[PDB]
Amino acid sequence: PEESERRALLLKRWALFKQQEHEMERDAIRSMLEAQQEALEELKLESAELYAEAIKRDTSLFPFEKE
């Protein structure tokens, strides 16, 4: 009824808020990815040869658990 209408109104605030959060988080990942890619580029200018070993994955890194 009218109470449901009010519940719908707060959903509009909440749904819009979540969408804003999603966009904010997506941009945060993009900056993080750009920085990580930018971090890759920076030492490549200094020495690309070093990366050839560095870019190789660490097999022993995992398992890694953190709460």
């Binding site: 990815l33 990580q36 994955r57 995992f62 398992p63």
Partner: protein, 104 residues
Amino acid sequence: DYEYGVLNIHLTAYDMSLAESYAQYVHRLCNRLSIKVEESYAMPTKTMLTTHERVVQISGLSATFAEIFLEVLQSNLPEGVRLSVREHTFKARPELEELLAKLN
């Protein structure tokens, strides 16, 4: 240069509801990040009261991608959820029919 193995996650939490959401939630991140999730199996109840745990089969990963993703999981981790990351351990008619030709 090597490709990461498939590492499963056991989302152990007091309430399955919250555990499922985080599982579903992280899966959405996985799909966005282009991470394939083969299965969403879950463990039984931890009878002694009980708890709840949700398996999350994460497949495919890279060294640079690994560092960012796992750290993101820490932030995403909702209230009182215990994370875990571990390396992983009936064919239908079209699949069998294709298989016959390959070895025939």
